[PDB]
């Protein structure tokens with residue numbers, strides 16, 4: 524996999540964000556995770572965590588996996604990095620997302636993220652509290 528540039532356009536929620544990619548506005552949905560909807564418990568906290576991470580970043584990058592790059596709603600599917608740190612993983616490590624939606628052929632970082640989820644659960648963080 525490789526990292527490609529993007530710039531933040533706007534926060535959306537815990538697991539989606541509006542980015543400019545190859546000069547076009549797209550909504551991105553984070554691979555391999557599910558944050559609570561803003562209406563649900565820890566939704567606000569997930570949104571805020573995601574928003575802060577991306578807005579504090581100097582450099583946002585997107586990394587597509589081997590499979591589908593857009594989902595059925597036209598959202599980009601990617602691992603998103605904020606100054607080299609993977610947002611998807613950070614959400615799971617903080618107990619603000621579950622590993623989820625692991626479809627074969629776009630699951631390169633599955634085991635990395637499950638390792639994070641296990642550490643979050645052990646610490647009883649947020650969703651695992």
Ligand SMILES: Cc1cn([C@H]2C[C@H](OP(=O)(O)O)[C@@H](COP(=O)(O)O)O2)c(=O)[nH]c1=O
Pocket residue numbers: 538552553554555556557594595600624626
């Ligand atoms: C994360 C992800 C979600 N999706 C689709 C599956 C779910 O369809 P449904 O809308 O029919 O439930 C939905 C979950 O996204 P959200 O969690 O953002 O709702 O997005 C994919 O197709 N590929 C993916 O990699």
Ligand SMILES: [Ca+2]
Pocket residue numbers: 538557558559560
């Ligand atoms: Ca969600």
